[PDB]
C-alpha cells in the first residue's frame, strides 16, 4: 500500500512495499505444489552452501 503523497516515486515506493511483503516471492512459491521432501532438500542445500561459503570465505593472497 502506497499513498501517492509525484507518481514516479510512488510506484517505486509501491514496488518496494510489495518486495517487502514477499508478495511476488509468495505467488511463485504457490504456483505449483512443492513436494515436502523437495522443500527440505532445497533448504538443506541452502544452509549447506551458505556455510560452505562463509567457511572458505574466512579462508579467504591471489597475487
Amino acid at each position: 500500500v502506497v499513498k501517492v503523497r509525484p507518481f514516479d516515486v510512488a510506484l517505486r515506493r509501491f514496488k518496494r512495499s510489495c518486495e517487502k511483503a514477499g508478495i511476488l516471492s509468495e505467488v511463485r512459491r504457490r504456483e505449483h505444489y512443492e513436494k515436502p521432501t523437495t522443500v527440505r532438500k532445497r533448504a538443506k542445500a541452502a544452509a549447506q552452501k551458505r556455510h560452505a561459503k562463509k567457511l572458505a570465505r574466512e579462508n579467504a593472497r591471489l597475487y
Partner: protein, 117 residues
C-alpha cells in the same frame, strides 16, 4: 452514464494476460480492457507494453464516466503490473493510492503439480 470522479483501477496481471477494470469505489464496473483484446495475442499479450495499451484503452473509455482520481489495486505476478500504472498517470488520472491486492493463501489449497517440462 452516471458521472463519477473518484474511482478504482483493478489491474489483474496474470503471467499470460493482463486485465484492467476501472470501477467506482463501490466496485461496480465502468470500463475494462485486456492485453489480449487490445491487439496483442499469444506471446505479446504477456508483455508490459500490451498491458499498457489495455490500461490506455480502458483509461480513454473511463473518461466517458468523467473519472479523475483512481486508486490502483495491482493483483498478481504478471508483466503488466508497473506498466499499467504508468499508463494511468500518463493518461491524466490522478493516482491516490497504489494497493497490492494479490491473493495470498495462509496455507490453503494444494497448488497444481509441478511442470516436468
Amino acid at each position: 452514464r452516471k458521472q463519477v470522479a473518484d474511482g478504482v483501477a483493478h489491474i489483474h496481471a496474470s503471467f499470460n494476460n493482463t486485465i484492467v477494470t476501472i470501477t467506482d469505489r463501490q466496485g461496480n464496473a465502468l470500463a475494462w480492457a485486456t492485453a489480449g483484446g487490445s491487439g496483442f495475442r499469444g506471446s505479446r499479450k504477456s508483455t508490459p507494453f500490451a498491458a499498457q495499451v489495455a490500461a490506455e484503452r480502458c483509461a480513454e473509455m473511463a473518461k466517458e464516466y468523467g473519472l479523475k482520481n483512481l486508486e490502483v489495486m495491482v493483483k498478481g505476478p504478471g508483466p503488466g503490473r508497473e506498466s499499467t500504472v504508468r499508463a494511468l498517470n500518463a493518461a491524466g488520472f490522478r493516482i491516490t493510492n497504489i494497493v497490492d491486492a494479490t491473493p495470498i493463501p495462509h496455507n490453503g489449497c494444494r497448488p497444481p503439480k509441478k511442470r516436468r517440462v
